[PDB]
Write a protein that binds this DNA or RNA. Structure first.
Ligand SMILES: Nc1ncnc2c1ncn2[C@@H]1O[C@H](CSCC[C@H](N)C(=O)O)[C@@H](O)[C@H]1O
Ligand SMILES: [Zn+2]
Length: 454
RNA sequence: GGCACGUGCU
């Protein structure tokens, strides 16, 4: 048949959503990491199931003219920048094409124009949050990253796609942790203290939250450590602790503590102040997220009498940025620390017509329906699993004219759009936005409406 | 190998 270590010549014909590398050998589809369309390779077979996968490039016979040859990127490719080996112009085209192909294949839609993916002018150094594991390598505490489905620390200081100030803070903390003899975590032994660093920095404000993810609550001399990090980075307004005593892949455990300062940072979006807790969600590309939100707000054509639902509201960024131009805003968020942020953020921006609830989107929608709230627009911003059929049905029963769907996954978006079409909402506009350059993640704004005029 | 309600997308 074909055996688990064979070398065979193959032509790469397509890219998967995740940035492999599609070939056909014998009868089977193979996924090859770091292989682009139009390339001819010798492929080393890693794994043979029926009727899929998986190979590795042994040799390039012909390379793609769109391949980025940067060796520094090539080390990041599996961990940080999934698509860094493809040129930026082709990353955008690839993301546009995926949206088109999803709407066609899954929802039957071919009659609607999908705009060209809106790209970032300087598609680098954009992330406002870093999550970095801390491990012992050759008896020395090292920071870096993990590759896909691996737990072997790849040392790294320059993360390519994050705020260089965050890189500096991580390195400074790495060196400080060494100077205070704090032991790093070891997954094999379950020994040590420091598991992870999470560092968030406001894109406009520059304010920094450091999170130390530890196995135990007591961190010897941590207050003296903090005094010194604050001295080199006065922008740090918050140092949090998160305790994770389990042996799991999850970064955070249940318990949070405040070690210094506040339990939030403040950053600006669309000219408003937002407080952001450690466990709350905040878009990591603040620049492009503004364009994403502005796109959705423009799609919605909000007027002074509109009633908006901001579902999957987070810290209230979308809803609060429109509440002064609108009659009422109703929002729902699952994470309590984010809902508490959104309530404070309303007060903070002198907003009196926002109503945030801590629930599941689906049974908040059900409550608002039973309470007789009459929304005219529904803004949704779900995670990758999309909306539940229960939410879609319920949102539609309100009779809201416009729905503005912000997606981070085209497969689930297209599924949900299909059901909205069945319920009388026509897909009107689609604008992909590149929130995560150099990665496989695609972000889309869709406008669905039941008005023939839009 | 992953993902979405024993096949559907990747
Ligand atoms: N079933 C659910 N109901 C309500 N919120 C949910 C949820 N599942 C996930 N969430 C939350 O929904 C958000 C998805 S990301 C969007 C957040 C926000 N609109 C912003 O862009 O800033 C996160 O805040 C996540 O914690
Ligand atoms: Zn994805």
């Amino acid at each position: 048949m074909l055996k688990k270590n064979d070398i065979v010549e193959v032509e790469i014909v397509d890219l998967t959503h995740e940035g492999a590398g599609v070939a056909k050998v014998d009868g089977l589809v193979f996924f090859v990491e770091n292989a682009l369309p139009s390339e001819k390779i010798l492929m080393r077979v890693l794994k043979v199931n029926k009727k899929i996968g998986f190979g590795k490039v042994e040799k390039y016979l012909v390379q793609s003219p769109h391949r980025n040859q940067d060796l520094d990127l090539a080390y990041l490719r599996s961990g940080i920048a999934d698509l860094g080996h493809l040129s930026y112009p082709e990353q955008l085209k690839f993301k546009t094409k995926q949206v088109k192909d999803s709407l066609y294949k899954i929802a039957g839609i071919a009659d609607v124009e999908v705009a060209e993916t809106l790209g970032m002018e300087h598609p680098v150094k954009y992330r406002n949050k870093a999550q970095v594991p801390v491990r012992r390598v050759n008896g020395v505490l090292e920071t870096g990253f993990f590759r896909k489905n691996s737990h072997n620390l790849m040392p790294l200081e320059d993360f390519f796609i994050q705020d260089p100030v965050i890189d500096q803070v991580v390195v400074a903390l790495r060196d400080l942790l060494r100077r205070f003899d704090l032991k790093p975590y070891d997954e094999k032994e379950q020994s040590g203290l420091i598991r992870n660093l999470v560092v968030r920095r406001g894109h406009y404000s520059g304010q920094i939250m450091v999170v130390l993810v530890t196995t135990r609550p007591k961190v010897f001399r941590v207050d003296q450590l903090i005094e010194q990090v604050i001295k080199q980075f006065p922008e740090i307004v918050s140092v949090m602790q998160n305790i994770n005593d389990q042996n799991t892949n999850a970064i955070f455990g249940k318990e949070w503590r405040t070690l210094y300062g506040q339990d939030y940072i403040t950053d600006q979006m669309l000219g408003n102040d937002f407080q952001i807790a450690g466990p709350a969600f905040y878009q990591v590309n603040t620049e492009m997220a503004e364009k994403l939100y502005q796109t959705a707000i423009d799609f919605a054509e909000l007027k002074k009498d509109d009633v908006i639902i901001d579902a999957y509201s987070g810290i209230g960024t979308i809803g609060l940025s429109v509440a002064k131009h609108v009659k009422e805003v109703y929002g729902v968020e699952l994470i309590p620390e984010a809902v508490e942020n959104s309530q404070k953020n309303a007060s903070l921006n002198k907003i009196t017509n926002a109503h945030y609830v801590c629930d599941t989107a689906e049974n908040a929608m059900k409550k608002w329906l039973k309470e007789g709230i009459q929304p005219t627009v529904i803004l949704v911003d779900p995670p990758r699993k999309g909306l539940t059929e229960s939410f879609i049905k319920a949102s539609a029963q309100t009779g809201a004219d416009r729905i503005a769907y912000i997606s981070c996954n085209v497969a689930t978006m297209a599924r949900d759009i299909k059901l909205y079409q069945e319920l009388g909402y026509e897909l009107k506009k689609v604008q992909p936005v590149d929130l995560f350059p150099q990665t496989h993640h695609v972000q889309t704004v869709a406008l669905l409406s039941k008005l023939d005029v839009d």
